[model samples]
Target chain A: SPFHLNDAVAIVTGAAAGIGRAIAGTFAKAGASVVVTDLKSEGAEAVAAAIRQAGGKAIGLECNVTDEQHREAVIKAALDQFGKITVLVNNAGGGGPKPFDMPMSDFEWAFKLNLFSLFRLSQLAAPHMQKAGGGAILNISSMAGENTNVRMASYGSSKAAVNHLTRNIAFDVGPMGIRVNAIAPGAIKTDEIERAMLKHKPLGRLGEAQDIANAALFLCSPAAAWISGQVLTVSGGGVQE
Target chain B: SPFHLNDAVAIVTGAAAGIGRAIAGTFAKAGASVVVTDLKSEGAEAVAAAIRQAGGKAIGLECNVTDEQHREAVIKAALDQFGKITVLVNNAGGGGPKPFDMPMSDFEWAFKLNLFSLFRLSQLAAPHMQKAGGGAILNISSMAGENTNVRMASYGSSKAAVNHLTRNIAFDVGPMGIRVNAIAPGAIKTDATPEIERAMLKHKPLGRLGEAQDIANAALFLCSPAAAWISGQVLTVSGGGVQE
Candidate 1:
């Protein structure tokens, strides 16, 4: 167990449900004042409520990570309420139910939600993290991105971008003491994952949300001090065939 | 305990000394017909003699991996002698002992001795393995290439190029059922290691240097079917490191 996270603050996007909710809960439990933001403010507050009930510090905010105005406000909210945003989990966006069959317009929309949104949020949060005397940024990617699979082009390609972007960003922000890394989840059991399993996954079981959360918590803590520009695949030991 | 490579055939370059010698010994013990090749034919023969004495099948060949003619002769020697080659361990070259205080001519010579030599040997071996029905190629890289270090620009950057080239070539040969991968050794105990121990040991989290066999074991696993789908990967076998 890492000591002294009581004064730490973090901003977790997409904290309303799925992997995002798990990350928010995990960080809050670890003693950070978590800012939970989701398009559905009510859903975000419910997660915050659960955290508060469990004796953790947390607050709920509404922001569309893809929208520039909302992005700034979300960053501003964290600074105003928590006094600092030490960690940023760009975990809000989800690929459409049918990313492979998605029309170009829909594909673009999904790309904005899954890939570009990560960059937008990361760009906005880097300065805050640097100002906070350097911190960690965890980008949520997926197994589908690393290996080629049909019907996941939008999500997969976007994630591929995240992996490459991670290396580039690491070189940029590493000197400032801010480290950027990405996690690629494989066959995860989430609300969005049930459909994915039925679609084209070879793995017999889906990964639990905690599997990814545990990885994120490790990276954000001092335990992963030397790990940066790395994309750890938390895919239940999924074989990349 | 993997049942994948029970009767495979493997060729190890520079098997006369260091990591190559260890790998040749290990592969033979793992049930593969091993071929040990090196410019130092006597050293290679000594390793082969030991393997045979231990009741394992092995042959020693004298060939320079960098020369096209010599590369062909080694492959031919392996085939004529073993009848087939299923795995290739491109462990011939290494970062030279010449300090980073060398000139460009010195750097080029070092690069050819280290990097280009690996490529030439791979080009020579790929087709023969494909004909033998798809196989694995394991390239030995170094941690200096993956991470930043002082006075190692030439050696490290060449290894970085090797890592990238491994990925590109993996894509090229992956469709042909041929798998290619690289092993980046961190701080292993070898002839070239003791002199660099003070600076290198600081990078290992395990607080100790690795034995040559540690790397050989990793190579054997990658060459075996247990790592069949793992291509284009530069596996860094560092005992965990904390960068300051």
Candidate 2:
């Protein structure tokens, strides 16, 4: 119970698999009531089912994070289920096309999904958190935000906005007792990333979704009460860099 | 303790008061034998004694951090008292004269206290930490490193360099089991900062000034094993956030 989240009702985006799945499960175990959401409704519901079966509280919802109505709808569902929204995890966004081959439509699409959606959702969720007396919002940003070399302009720049918005918006919401922070992970190791950096991965193992889940657990809990507007990087020494 | 540092021996610079004092006591409570160091020995000794009375281990040393010889002396004393040092928190630096009105010597003075001394002391401590098998080094940087408008260029630029230095050192010393990081704090409410409170709070959404312990808790977490995979990162501990 070191980083306990007892009675904390939360929502996790993209909770069907990977880091988002791990965070949902971990938060449930930490005593949070989790609302598991994903673009795929079935997958999210299954994850929520798994949490409940394991003696935790949870519900699942279909959510397209890029959609304005979907974000508002999820906030309403979380509030209706638990009566308070104490935490929100914006973990849905990911990579986009390379710069040269990409069209502006796709470029704008990436920003809408990755950066803009996060802020709008936080805006929707803020009043509830204030009523709850305080809450935490954790954005899953990436090292691609800063330490990138490939033609990841769209992905990198949007995640870069995630970092800045984390700080600036924390300034915006902190008076309501909401803390905003981000995790800019470098190598959480998909199969491709592992093989790409085989020789360089110095920690001698690949990162697990659980690694990020553990960081999420701490940042959202009361233990990190004084922390806001910071990005905690979990890169295993940032070995690839 | 999820973030325990048992059996670890640390040297916290500027240990007499504020963030430094809070970190020293917090680390001691979490089971680190600390060397309380400062430019003046009297306050350092008093802090060390208070730690001892609270059932923690600590020693006091006089350390003029701007001096090259003083850095070695403190390192030697930590080794002499605790055998092998495992942690170092460089917290000695502070504000300098405003950039437009400042002399070149004042600029140099700022770098000596804020930037160079940190790298130099990190140079002195790394070997011992390497000898001890593994260690953690934390530089007490500032939000001024990245977000700044108060016009202390010498101070802000020096801290900016400290942020880069942290990542570079983590890269250099990591293979040897030493992990280096920095804590960039914003608008901590120390006695010296009271006049600036009203101006800072408007940007800070937390609606309250940050306490020294807020920074201390963050410093503890970065140094603790819970953050083992974390290295080469600057963890900002601003209340709400720093203004743009």
Candidate 1 wrongly placed segments (more than 4 Å):
A1-241, B1-4, B96-101, B191-200, B242-244
Mind giving the per-residue lDDT tens digits that candidate 2 earns over A22-105? 999999988999999999999999999999999999999999998988988999999889999999999998665486578887
Q: Which docking category, incorrect, acceptable, medium or high, applies to candidate 1?
A: incorrect
Candidate 2 matches the true fold with a TM-score of 0.88
Fnat of every candidate, listed in order: 0.00, 0.58
Candidate 1's residue-wise lDDT over A146-225, tens digit each?
Answer: 78766766767777888888767776777566767787776566875356443332223456777677667766765444
Off by over 4 Å in 2: A1-3, A49-55, A103-105, A147-150, A190-206, A237-241, B99-101, B148-151, B192-196
The candidate that wins on TM-score is 2
lDDT of 2: 0.85
Clashes of each: 0, 2
Candidate 1 has what TM-score?
0.54
Candidate 1, DockQ to 2 decimals? 0.04
List clashing residue pairs in candidate 1. Answer: none
Q: Cα deviation in Å at residue B242, candidate 2?
A: 3.9
DockQ of each: 0.04, 0.54
